[PDB]
Structures are given as C-alpha cells and as structure tokens.
Amino acid sequence: LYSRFPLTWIMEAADDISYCVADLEDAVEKRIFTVEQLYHHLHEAWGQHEKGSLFSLVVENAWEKSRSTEDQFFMYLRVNTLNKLVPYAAQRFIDNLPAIFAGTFNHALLEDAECSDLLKLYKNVAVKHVFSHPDVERLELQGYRVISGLLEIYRPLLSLSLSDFTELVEKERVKRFPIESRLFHKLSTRHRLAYVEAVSKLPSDSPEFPLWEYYYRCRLLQDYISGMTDLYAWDEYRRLMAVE
Amino acid sequence: QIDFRKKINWHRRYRSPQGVKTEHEILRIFESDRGRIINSPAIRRLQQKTQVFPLERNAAVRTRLTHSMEVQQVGRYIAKEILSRLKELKLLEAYGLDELTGPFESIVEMSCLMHDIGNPPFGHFGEAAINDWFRQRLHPEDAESQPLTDDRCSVAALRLRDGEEPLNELRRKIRQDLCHFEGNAQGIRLVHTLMRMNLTWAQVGGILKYTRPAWWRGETPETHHYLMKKPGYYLSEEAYIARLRKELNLALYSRFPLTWIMEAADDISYCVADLEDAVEKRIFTVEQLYHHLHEAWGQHEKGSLFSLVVENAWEKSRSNSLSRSTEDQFFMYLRVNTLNKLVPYAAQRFIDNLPAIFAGTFNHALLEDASECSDLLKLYKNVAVKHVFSHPDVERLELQGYRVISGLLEIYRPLLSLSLSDFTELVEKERVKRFPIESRLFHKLSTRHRLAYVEAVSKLPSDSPEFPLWEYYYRCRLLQDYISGMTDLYAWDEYRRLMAVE
Amino acid sequence: LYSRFPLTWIMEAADDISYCVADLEDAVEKRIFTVEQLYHHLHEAWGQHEKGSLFSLVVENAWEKSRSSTEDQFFMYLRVNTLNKLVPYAAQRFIDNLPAIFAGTFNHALLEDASECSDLLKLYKNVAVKHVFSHPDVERLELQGYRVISGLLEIYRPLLSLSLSDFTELVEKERVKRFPIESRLFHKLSTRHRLAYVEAVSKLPSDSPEFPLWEYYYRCRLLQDYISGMTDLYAWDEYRRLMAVE
Numbered sequence A: 001l002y003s004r005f006p007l008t009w010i011m012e013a014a015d016d017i018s019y020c021v022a023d024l025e026d027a028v029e030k031r032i033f034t035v036e037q038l039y040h041h042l043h044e045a046w047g048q049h050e051k052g053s054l055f056s057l058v059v060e061n062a063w064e065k066s067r068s069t070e071d072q073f074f075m076y077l078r079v080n081t082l083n084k085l086v087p088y089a090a091q092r093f094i095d096n097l098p099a100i101f102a103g104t105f106n107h108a109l110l111e112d113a114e115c116s117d118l119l120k121l122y123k124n125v126a127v128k129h130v131f132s133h134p135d136v137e138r139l140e141l142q143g144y145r146v147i148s149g150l151l152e153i154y155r156p157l158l159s160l161s162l163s164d165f166t167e168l169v170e171k172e173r174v175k176r177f178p179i180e181s182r183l184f185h186k187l188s189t190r191h192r193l194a195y196v197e198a199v200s201k202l203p204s205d206s207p208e209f210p211l212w213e214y215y216y217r218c219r220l221l222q223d224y225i226s227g228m229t230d231l232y233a234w235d236e237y238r239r240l241m242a243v244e
Numbered sequence B: 001q002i003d004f005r006k007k008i009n010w011h012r013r014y015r016s017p018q019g020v021k022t023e024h025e026i027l028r029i030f031e032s033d034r035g036r037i038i039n040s041p042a043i044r045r046l047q048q049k050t051q052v053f054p055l056e057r058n059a060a061v062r063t064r065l066t067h068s069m070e071v072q073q074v075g076r077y078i079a080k081e082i083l084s085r086l087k088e089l090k091l092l093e094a095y096g097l098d099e100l101t102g103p104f105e106s107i108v109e110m111s112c113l114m115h116d117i118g119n120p121p122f123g124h125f126g127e128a129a130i131n132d133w134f135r136q137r138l139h140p141e142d143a144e145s146q147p148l149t150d151d152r153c154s155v156a157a158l159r160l161r162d163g164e165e166p167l168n169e170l171r172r173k174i175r176q177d178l179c180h181f182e183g184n185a186q187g188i189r190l191v192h193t194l195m196r197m198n199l200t201w202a203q204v205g206g207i208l209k210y211t212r213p214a215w216w217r218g219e220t221p222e223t224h225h226y227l228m229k230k231p232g233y234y235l236s237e238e239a240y241i242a243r244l245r246k247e248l249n250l251a252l253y254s255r256f257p258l259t260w261i262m263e264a265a266d267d268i269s270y271c272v273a274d275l276e277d278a279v280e281k282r283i284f285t286v287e288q289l290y291h292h293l294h295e296a297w298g299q300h301e302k303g304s305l306f307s308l309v310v311e312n313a314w315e316k317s318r319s320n321s322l323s324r325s326t327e328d329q330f331f332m333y334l335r336v337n338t339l340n341k342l343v344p345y346a347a348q349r350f351i352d353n354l355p356a357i358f359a360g361t362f363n364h365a366l367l368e369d370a371s372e373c374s375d376l377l378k379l380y381k382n383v384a385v386k387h388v389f390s391h392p393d394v395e396r397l398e399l400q401g402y403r404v405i406s407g408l409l410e411i412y413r414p415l416l417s418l419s420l421s422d423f424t425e426l427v428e429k430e431r432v433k434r435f436p437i438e439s440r441l442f443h444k445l446s447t448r449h450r451l452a453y454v455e456a457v458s459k460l461p462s463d464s465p466e467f468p469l470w471e472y473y474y475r476c477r478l479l480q481d482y483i484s485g486m487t488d489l490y491a492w493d494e495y496r497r498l499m500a501v502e
Numbered sequence C: 001l002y003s004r005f006p007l008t009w010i011m012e013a014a015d016d017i018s019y020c021v022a023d024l025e026d027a028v029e030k031r032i033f034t035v036e037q038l039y040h041h042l043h044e045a046w047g048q049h050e051k052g053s054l055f056s057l058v059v060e061n062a063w064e065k066s067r068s069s070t071e072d073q074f075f076m077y078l079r080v081n082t083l084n085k086l087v088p089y090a091a092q093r094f095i096d097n098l099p100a101i102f103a104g105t106f107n108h109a110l111l112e113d114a115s116e117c118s119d120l121l122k123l124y125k126n127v128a129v130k131h132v133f134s135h136p137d138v139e140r141l142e143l144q145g146y147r148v149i150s151g152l153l154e155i156y157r158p159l160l161s162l163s164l165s166d167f168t169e170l171v172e173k174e175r176v177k178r179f180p181i182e183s184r185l186f187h188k189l190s191t192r193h194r195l196a197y198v199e200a201v202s203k204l205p206s207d208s209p210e211f212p213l214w215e216y217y218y219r220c221r222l223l224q225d226y227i228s229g230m231t232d233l234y235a236w237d238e239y240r241r242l243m244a245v246e
C-alpha cells in the first residue's frame, strides 16, 4: 500500500528534464526575447559562477557553439543537458535500485541538492519571463471561466433526485425534463456507458447506493469535461452560451 | 485685493522651480505644461472614448478628444476676450496680468483640454456602474448615523463596530468616498498620483471644478451650494488638495479663478456639436431641426437672441453661396452666432464679478440660469434631449456600457473579496500558490495604478488601527483607477476576453 | 512664381522634429524593444562619438535622467532635450536667413543637412527605419493598404471607362437605363466632391476643343478626391463591402 512501480521514476525524470528547455526554445520563437537576452537571464540566474560548473559545461558551452544561431543554440543546449543529466539519473536509479524496486524510495532521480540546480535554473527563467507573459496568463484565466461556466451549464443534471435522474437513464425521452434530456445526450457515449456499468454493479437495497450514484454522477460529468480538448471545451462553452 | 501674480503659481509639487524667473522663463514653464498634457497618453485615450454617438466606421462624428479641442478654442476666445476688455479698461497691469497674458490663456486651453480627462470609459454611465457596484458591496447609507445592528456592508473592517470608536468616522468617510466616484475628482487623482505629470499648481487649479470632498454626506453649505454641486476630489487627494489651496491662495471650498472660464466654454460646446452630428447621422434634416428649435422657443420676439443667432444662421444657410453645403453653412454660422453673443457675456460676467471670482467664493456660473444666454443653451439641450439623446442607438450603447463595467467590476471582485494578509502576500510574491486566479487578475492591472497603490500603502504606519481600513480604501481605489483609465473599446474588448468569447 | 510663404518653413521644421521621436516612444510601447535596447541602438547609430556633442547633451542626458515611469521620464526628457536645442537653432536660422525666407526663395531647410541638429534627427530616423518601420505588423498593414486602394480604384474603373456623352447623361438623370452599376457607383461618391466636379465643369466653355480633356481631368480628380478623403477604416470597410464579404 502506497508503493510505486519501479519504472515510473524513469518516466518522471524525462518529464522533469524536457519540462522547461522546450518552452524556453518556444519563448525565443514567440519573440518574447532574443536567444542572447535569454543567455543573459540565465547568467543573472546562476549567480554563484565557477569556470567548471554544469552551467559552463552546458549553457556557456552551448552559447559558444551558437556563435560561429537559435537552432544551434537550443540543439546543443538540449544535447549538453541530456549528455550530463541522463547518466546521472541512470546511475541514481541503479544506485538506489532496492528502494526503487520496493517503490518506497521517498525521492526523485534528479533530487534537490548539480543536475536539479540546472533544471531549477531553467524553471526560474521560465517562471520569471515566459509563464509570466500576459498572453499566457490571459488564456490561463480564460480557461478557468470556460470550465467553470461549462460545469454550471451541466449543474441541472446534478441538481436532481436519483428517482428523476435514473428515469432519464432508462427512457431517453423524458416529459418534464427536456433540457436535462438534451444535456444528458450531449455527454459522450463512453462516459455515459461507464456510469451505468458502475451503477448496475451496486446493490439496489444498500443505504450507500444513493451516495454511490451521486459520486458516479459527478464522475460521469467530470469525465466528459476532462475528456475535451482546449478547443472543444471553448467552442462548446460559446455554443451553450449561445454566441455561434 | 486682485493680483494674478498670486494666483498664477508657476511652482510645482515635486522637483519645483524657485527664485525670480523672467516673463519668458515663466512662459516657458507654462508652455512646458502644454507639451506635458499634449504628449500624455491620458489625452490620446480620448480619441477612443465615446461622445454621445457610438464610435462609427467614419470619423465624421465627434469623440471625447475632438469635442475637448472644440471646448479649448471656446475657452481661448473667452480668456482672450476677458484680457482685451481689461486692456481697454487698463486694469491689466493693475490686476498683475500685464506679464502673465499668454500663461493665463494657455491655462484655460489646457484645462479645457483636460476636462473629461478623468472620465471613465462609458462616461456618466460608467460612473453609475462603478458607484452602484460599490454601493451593493458597501451601502454607505448604513454609515450615516449610529452603528446599525444589521450593517449591509460586505467588508468586516468597514462595518461600523458597535457603540464605540472614532474609527467609525473613518469607515463613514471611506464608504462615501469610494461610492461617490466622479470624473472631475478622478481627473485630479490622475494628473498627480496616476499620470505623475508634475504640473504647475495654477494648471491643476484650473481642472479643480468642484470644492466638495467625495466623502461628504450632509446638506451642502447654503453659501457654497453651487461650488459643491458635485464632488471635486477624493480622500486620497485631501493631502495634496490642501497643498493646492495654500499654493493658489484658496479658502476651504474656494475655486481657482480661471476654472469658471473653462467651465463656461464646456457649457457652450456642450450641445451644438452633437446637434450637428445628429443631422449628420440623418436623425432629422437641418430644416426639421430649425422647426424643432422654433417649437422650443415659444415666446417669440423679433429682436431676441433666437432671431440674432438661430433665425440669423437659418437665413444664411438658405441661398448660401461660397458653394458651401446648407448644413455646413448652417452649423458654421450657428456656432459663430452663439459665440459672438455668449463669449462677450461670460467675458463681461467674469470681469463684473471678478473680486468674488478671484476669491473663488462666487456661488454662480458665468452663464447663469436667468440670462438670455443660459436660455439659448437650454434650448439646444432640450432639443438634444427630446430628439438626439433619446435615439435608440445611443440608449443601446448607454445600457451596453453599464453591463460591460458592472461585469468587469465583478470579474475583479475576487481581489477585493480577500483578507489583507492574503492580498499583501500577493503584492510581495508575484506568484502565489493557493490564489492563482487572483495572481493573474492582479497582473492584468496596469503597472502605474499598481505602483500608486503600494506607494500610498508604504506611507501609512503598520502599527495603526486605521491601517487595514486605509489598505482597503486604496485597494478599491487601485481597481477604480484601472477601469476608469480604460477606453470604451478596451473595457468592452476586455469584458469579452474575460467572458471568453475571443 | 515658385516662391514659398515665409511661415511655411517654421511649420515644416516642427514636423521634421516631431517626426520620429513619437513613433520611437510608441515602438517601446508596442514592446518592439526595451528603452534600454533603444538607447544601445542609438549609441550604435551615432558612431562618431566625441565632444560634448548633441548626443551627450540630448540622448545621453535623457538616459541618465530616466535611471532614478522609466520610459515616460526617458521620452519626456528626450523630447524636452531635443526641443531645447533644436527650436533655438531653427528660430535663429529663420531670423539669420529672413530676407531669402521673406522672399520665399531660400533653397534650404531651417535644420539643414550639415547642422548637428539635422544629424540628431537623422539618427532618430535611421533607428526608426532599421527597427520600427521594418517591423512586420507595420509592413503587413502597408501592403494591405496598397491592395485596398488599388482594388477600390478598380471598383470605380467603370465610371472612368466611359464616354463623355454617357457620363454627362449620368450626371443629369440620376437613374440611367443601360448603366445601372455605374449609376449606383456614382451615387456612392460623396456629395461634396460630386458638387465640385459639376462646378469645375460648368465653368468650362461647351464649344472649346479642350472641354472633353478637362471633363476627364476633373472626372479623375473627382474619383481621387473620394478615395483620398476616406479614413484607413472607411476605405478598408468599403473595399470589403464592395468585394462582398460583409
């Protein structure tokens, strides 16, 4: 109980690496700053400078390769990073393999205490310059309302009695609840199917049965929404707000 | 004693110049102010702020900017008139003006320009949507008397704490100040605390239209009724306002002698322009309009100012040569006709009542109610009300504006619906864990109003029991500044963007 | 003949000055580069750095004032700095060369090429050209504008691609049988430029052999007036409307 699969740690690592550098490449691509501007933000961020550190070995190294640009810079920066970080995590894994095999090891392959530092450096720069950009933040806020509003559009299905809701599940066409009918039809056939199946496995007699139904009802709604793409959710929000 | 040397204060608030200066040096300081104003983005914003009619695909219609330029030329004429009349009376040197001629005039023009500068996106409708949004959240009426057992205020700190505290008076003032937003008051706030222009005292005097504090709750002084008609400044400016009075030699609730000139110009340019635009938007013909004006006058005499202005301009339009359009000629001479009779009146009125005007105690307008002049203006206004201001496209936009601002204010409610400890946290760390929406929403706020909030806050004593009340007053002010700062377009665009339809 | 009004030179000068600095302010406002980035582009552009030059007196001066809004203060004092040195120069130049200016024969500008003043302006211009005027959003709109006008001119080609006898016919009768497109297109023209055409035409002698040539000259003028009279928005709006996309 509470033990992790030994390979999960490897997958996690790669995600933690790829994580920033790619968005940083895209940042210069969206013209947020130059590749030169970025290098200077990274120099500023390191502070405790030594001529043999991983900064020199990776970032300083990739900067020199670019001069006698952007492509070469990111291309070798990526290389430089993997070429030092991958061996570390590969080792870390092997080194702490018993606890990892157990899936009890309470740490990451790229810890906190030089590799973790380099990553953190990318992250800080990304936070302070990229993640902070208004167009990003605008969209982030936009997203929030889209989902909140969409959830409210589907509130009528939740703001209902079991006896009524179940009725809608059997008869597709219900007299008194036509909005709720149509709204339930909007739900994807797979999440719909899944709800019914989880429900049919419960004992009718049980006092917990109505609680379960609701848990599942909400799950069903959650599945629909989470299942959507950024586009589909936005499109639907407008369509159900009646602006198309 | 009347001495304009004492009223035309060429000194500034910060980095202020001092010591002697020639006629030329002085002119240059006032000319400096012009450049400051004219290059201000706050002045550019006005080409995107609506004036009566919606911002149409063709600039044929006047915007807040184009109207204010028109007002400024009127102001120029009046000021120039006062001066010429006075030189003919030889009183120019006598009133300490012989060397402040140009400055006097420039101040008028610049104040004229800057009228409406502090107005919100949807003007008077914006004011409403702001004040109303704050009223449902503060209920300043619940503060007027004794602490109500059921205070409708949504804010814990601003709710009148029971049978004790002089802090109860601070709560009263904050609630009234925030719920009584006025463009003129915001204008003062803007040029100093927001735009950080650092203008000559004299200039800032000219844009101080009313002497009423925003926090005022009671009946208006009988003797100062007119001067306190609307609020002129906020609680946030009270300090600076005191500084202004002392610099310009003004008693509590006393007006700057030139403000009266600027006011007058805006009372004239006011309608005629929209009436021109009305015929342009085809609401009625120029002929139809003339007949609405004839209908409106009623008590017709063959030598009245109607005959001298409107009847006169109507005759000029018919068999108008110069290959000029009927409408063009009509409005062109109607404008002329008006100024040609009204400007001298107000110019005289000023000179006639100069001691009380110099004092800034004069409880009346240059074109006051009884005057045949005030009547002519009212005539234009009536016609405009009954036919132009009543048009559906106008009214549609008026209603539209209201919702845009109200909705926008609600979008920013989360920042206000917060604890000081939390809000302050967001001010220091730009990235806050638990409040991500609030974070991003606070980033949406403009860097200048943001800066201003922090500055007002850093000047307060941490220890003080009033400190949390102040923070909130300022917090609201900050939000108000953002919104009021927007153009009709930006506010609408943002409303849609934040409602997620783009 | 070919002599200029003595005051025109003053107005001209004001435009040569205001010309760039404002767009440069707007450039940093549209985030094209920082105020710091711009200062460095100006340092790069000066090249021949020496003296208590006007660069030091204006740009270097304004840069120092900005350090302890930064941008506002920078442009505010940069503007000041410029006027404070350039205005006196041109004011002098005017007075100095007043006889030739009064004559309106003076074959030069108040801020002429060799003056340190002209150099400062040119500096702003170069930076604006190389960084601001070159931006894609600018250029996009510039190209867009071209098509809008060209297309609009083509939409109105039918009125020009006509005989005098036919065109005149359209001027008298507002409704013409055989030319309905041309009718409606002529109605689209603004009442003022329309009026002006007729007036210039009615002033010509009917009998004259030059009369048909004049009619055409005026016809084109009339079209030109309509277009030139439009705002960027109205011309674009009309282009779309007449291309049928609204």
Ligand SMILES: [Mn+2]
Binding pocket: A015, A019
């Ligand atoms: Mn990932």
Ligand SMILES: [Mn+2]
Binding pocket: B067, B071, B266, B269, B270
């Ligand atoms: Mn007005």
Ligand SMILES: [Mn+2]
Binding pocket: C015, C019
């Ligand atoms: Mn120009």
